[PDB]
Design a protein around this ligand. Structure first.
Ligand SMILES: CC(=O)N[C@H]1[C@H](O[C@H]2[C@H](O[C@H](C)C(=O)O)[C@@H](NC(C)=O)[C@@H]3OC[C@H]2O3)O[C@H](CO)[C@@H](O)[C@@H]1O
Ligand code: NA
Length: 237
């Protein structure tokens, strides 16, 4: 079944592992579908779903890689660590610009927030390729400055009911907005309705694997004082 939700569900129980893209050496396309975090999960699922079926069945491994590269890197060009779309605002913009994402909250929510993005250059010790690369830090600062100050639409968490909203659909990509200083998004997953509740399929660092949430997305948001709302994105084909 070639849809976002069904391809997400195929990842249930896959282990959560941090830093799977961060091997020593040059930035190259890393494919690790057996160990994921919240972002790489969404990237693999989107890449698979974008890839057409072969006349034989299943998909071309090179086509999958090529599509993953378009999702993960700025205009699909691999050119050092800083070419990876580290910030989700930037990742969203890349998908919108290149025609494979649309911004659903931009079409449905009257609420906006102004981006203020500086986390990585402020905390370079947290990133292997920043911790001892002054050049990469300077490059990231320019990217951060380019992103910061723009307004984006979002759904404040108080406005998300347990039963979701009718314009949020199964398979939508959910990006959780955050009050962490200098950071736009803290977590991601895939929308899934069950028992008239909007749940999230996501790579859970707490449960150490990909799960369906046991409570609605609304409750996930309410329970976390750093989480402020969501952006809702949708694959476009
Ligand atoms: C800004 C940032 O940290 N970007 C990284 C991203 O973090 C994610 C991180 O979420 C983690 C994985 C989680 O919630 O378990 C979050 N980063 C921080 C600093 O909270 C944020 O939300 C999605 C994305 O940015 O991860 C990518 C894949 O490994 C990395 O390529 C990318 O560098
Ligand atoms: Na923030």
């Amino acid at each position: 079944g070639k849809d976002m939700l069904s391809n997400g569900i195929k990842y249930l129980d896959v282990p959560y592992v941090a830093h799977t893209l961060e091997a020593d050496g040059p930035e190259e396309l890393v494919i690790n579908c057996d160990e994921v975090d919240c972002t790489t999960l969404v990237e693999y699922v989107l890449a698979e779903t974008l890839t057409p079926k072969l006349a034989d069945g299943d998909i071309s491994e090179s086509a999958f890689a090529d599509n993953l590269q378009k999702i993960r890197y700025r205009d699909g060009k691999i050119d050092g660590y800083t070419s990876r779309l580290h910030y989700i605002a930037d990742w969203i913009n890349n998908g919108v610009r290149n025609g494979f994402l649309q911004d659903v909250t931009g079409a449905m929510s009257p609420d906006t927030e102004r981006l203020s993005i500086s986390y990585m250059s402020s905390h370079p010790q947290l990133y292997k390729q920043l911790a001892n690369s002054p050049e990469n830090v300077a490059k990231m600062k320019k990217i951060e400055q380019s992103l910061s100050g723009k307004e984006v639409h979002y759904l404040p968490k108080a406005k998300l009911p347990a039963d979701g909203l009718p314009w949020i659909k199964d398979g939508d990509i959910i990006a959780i907005t955050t009050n962490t200083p200098g950071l736009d998004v803290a977590h991601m997953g895939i929308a899934f309705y069950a028992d008239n509740k909007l749940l999230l399929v996501h790579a859970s660092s707490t449960d150490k694997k990909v799960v369906v949430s046991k409570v609605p997305l609304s409750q996930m948001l309410k329970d976390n004082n750093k989480w402020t709302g969501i952006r809702v994105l949708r694959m476009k084909k």
